[PDB]
Amino acid sequence: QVQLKQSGPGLVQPSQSLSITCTVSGFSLTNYGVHWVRQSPGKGLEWLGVIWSGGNTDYNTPFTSRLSINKDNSKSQVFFKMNSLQSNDTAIYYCARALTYYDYEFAYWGQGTLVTVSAASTKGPSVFPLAPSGGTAALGCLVKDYFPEPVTVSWNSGALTSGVHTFPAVLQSSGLYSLSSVVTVPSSSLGTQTYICNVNHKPSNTKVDKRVEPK
Amino acid sequence: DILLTQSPVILSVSPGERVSFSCRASQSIGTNIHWYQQRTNGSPRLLIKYASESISGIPSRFSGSGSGTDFTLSINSVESEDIADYYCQQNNNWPTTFGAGTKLELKRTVAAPSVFIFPPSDEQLKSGTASVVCLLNNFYPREAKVQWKVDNALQSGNSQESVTEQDSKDSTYSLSSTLTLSKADYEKHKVYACEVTHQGLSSPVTKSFNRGA
């Protein structure tokens, strides 16, 4: 069907520029316009601009001078670029497509791209086991000291999803994030099944698979 | 630009009940309004277009009405997976603008937490820092107290809490409390306990361990 896949999240220094690629499938860029929307703590949902089928662009008024949208029809790619980012430009950026070629009811969305504007440095996390000690055992992974958000965590390469809780990251006094991911399983499976949290911090391309066993 | 005002900001109902979301525009926009659902870690999902028109694949319990300045999104029988924020969008006047959203929570019966405690791993202790995690699992309502004690000394200021959003299946919350201390401090003590207070417990539950078993 119709899909929009955006490039990965990342850090951007203040006064610097942002680049996001939206790759579409299930339709042609020559038939549909592609919109850009962001979502920030300061202003919530915000329509930024659009590139139409024929290449014309419209930019929302407070962005006309620092926003540039381009595309490559043959490669089904839309390119979003924004200049001179500041802290309140920290937000999740989506590309989106409407039901009809001319309209603004956004029926298809990219998965979003979380952009963090900060002078700090990217750092990958360390992954530590939370080891199991009514026949239900809890276990998890401690994903500690990374920057910036986000980090993705799954269990057994996607095969274990029931009973999983991945808590929201919290910012430590160090300026680094930390979170835990937990799952409850039958304690009788601890000697039979292997349990692995799959951690990926794309801003640093740090990918860690942590095996969690009873101590 | 058109200002879209959504009310209330929070909405708490029980399953099977009908619920209504409000969206008011700063001037008439006819019926040029769209509604969206955003689940936890999800992208917005189009529910209604032009005030009242259905969308493919959207359950029939979602409907919308209104015209002019006052618009309503309705769910006649709330389900658990309806937990989300809901947004309205206008497009009668350029540029298209969005409301600030209304959060929909679900009520359910009281559920006491299951409490687990994890010592720091020997791996982390190599790094010179110790993390003690106390997990409160699948409880309701959200309010809960976590009290840390090291050798009966009350810990204050050196723990952080994180709380999941409501679960889409059983409407419960889960909470993690992480006590962070230096390895030197951690080695200078023995008894590590988190005490958990919650409406669903007749008395507080304490999970503890002694460093080195």
Partner: peptide, 12 residues
Amino acid sequence: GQYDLSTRRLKG
């Protein structure tokens, strides 16, 4: 009432 980038949800 404010949107949180960590959870993609409204918090307060």
